[PDB]
């Protein structure tokens, strides 16, 4: 109801527009796990533009999600998180979080296309 997974070009795109802690995290992550499981996708794309505030709970959840997807397929946090979000994430969720494409969604799309091309 709030987790719009899209399918295109053997990839997955998710836009986050909820900014909530508990339900957002659990429903979003479980639905992505089910989707990437039953549908084989080499790359996943996660949008964080609308998000402007992250606590420890959500940072932990996104770390788990990225580790999980990497255990099942290539991943990018396509949209560069907000500066406050960035500092909050680095202060507690110390992870490289894979590779991203500087908050241009099509930049991440083409990065996945070129990594899939090889």
């Amino acid at each position: 109801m709030g987790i719009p997974i899209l399918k295109l070009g053997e990839c997955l795109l998710i836009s986050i527009q909820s900014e909530l802690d508990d339900h957002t995290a659990v429903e979003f992550q479980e639905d992505l796990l089910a989707k990437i499981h039953e549908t084989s996708a080499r790359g996943v794309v996660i949008d964080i533009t609308s998000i402007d505030f992250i606590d420890s709970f959500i940072a932990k959840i996104l770390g788990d999600v990225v580790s999980m997807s990497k255990l099942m397929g290539a991943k990018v946090v396509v949209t560069g998180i907000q500066p406050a979000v960035a500092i909050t994430l680095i202060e507690l969720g110390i992870t490289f979080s894979g590779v991203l494409s500087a908050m241009d969604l099509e930049s991440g799309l083409e990065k996945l296309k070129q990594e899939l091309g090889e």
Partner: protein
């Protein structure tokens, strides 16, 4: 002294039949009626109780074989150990009523004392001991053989490709199963030559945290031996358990499908793709 014992059982057979009639009323009466009819059950019971009393105080080899057959038949027919125990209890009850009416023992006298009284019960206990021994002779044997089948079907590395090895595991695994899996994978990879090893985790619904830790340790160990371990097809929940484990997860290369695992393996062995 089984001679007069046999003579008294020759009369107690009818009492045993009446006891069986009484006992089919309480436990699973429709089931007992359906599985065995009255004449067949009566003849089986009298044949089971009259052959031993004809032996000379020790045993009967033919009776021992027939007792094993009767035990397995009643176990597989609808008379489990609980039913046999109820049958022994009602046997004792109706023999007690029979003596309270008949009063005919081994030593002929005006009123025999309690020595033959409890000799009867000791002989009945020995009969039931033989019955339960027959019941327990082979059940542990088939338990052992099914355990052997379960352990031998754990990690078949026999799936082998050209310089490629793959081990599919599908059943739910515990600590003993995990130890068997890692040992079998290691002994296989040290026996035959390979460059990559693909572990098909797809099939196992949920694993324990320690089990996933052992799987990661096995992957690292087989990497150490000199073979890359591509954990192929990890379910989301095992991924959850592995991530919450917190162990380092950079070396393990994973693909969600066995076909993608095969093509990745053929990519690693560069000239094997042709």
């Amino acid at each position: 002294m089984y001679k007069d014992f046999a003579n008294f059982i020759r009369t107690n057979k009818k009492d045993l039949l009446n006891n069986w009639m009484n006992e089919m009323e309480k436990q699973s009466d429709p089931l007992i009626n359906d599985i065995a009819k009255e004449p067949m059950y009566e003849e089986t019971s009298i044949e089971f109780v009259d052959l031993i009393v004809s032996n000379i105080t020790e045993n009967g080899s033919k009776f021992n074989e027939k007792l094993d057959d009767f035990a397995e038949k009643v176990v597989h027919l609808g008379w489990p150990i609980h039913f046999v125990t109820t049958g022994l209890r009602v046997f004792g009850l109706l023999v007690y009523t029979a003596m309270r009416d008949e009063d005919l023992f081994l030593k002929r006298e005006e009123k025999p004392e309690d020595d033959a009284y409890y000799r009867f019960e000791t002989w009945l206990s020995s009969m039931y001991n033989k019955v339960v021994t027959a019941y327990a002779d082979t059940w542990e044997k088939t338990v052992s053989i099914q355990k052997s089948a379960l352990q031998e079907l754990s990690a078949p590395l026999l799936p082998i490709f050209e310089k490629i090895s793959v081990m599919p595991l599908i059943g739910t695994i515990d600590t003993e199963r995990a130890k068997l899996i890692i040992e079998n994978l290691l002994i296989g990879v040290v026996k035959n030559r390979s460059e990559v090893v693909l572990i098909d985790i797809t099939g196992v619904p949920v694993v324990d945290t320690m089990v996933a830790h052992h799987i990661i340790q096995a992957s690292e160990a087989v990497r150490l031996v000199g073979c890359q371990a591509m954990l192929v097809g990890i379910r989301p929940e095992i991924a959850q358990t592995i991530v919450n484990l917190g162990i380092e997860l950079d070396q393990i290369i994973t693909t969600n499908t066995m076909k993608k695992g095969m093509e990745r393996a053929l990519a690693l062995t560069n000239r094997e793709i042709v």
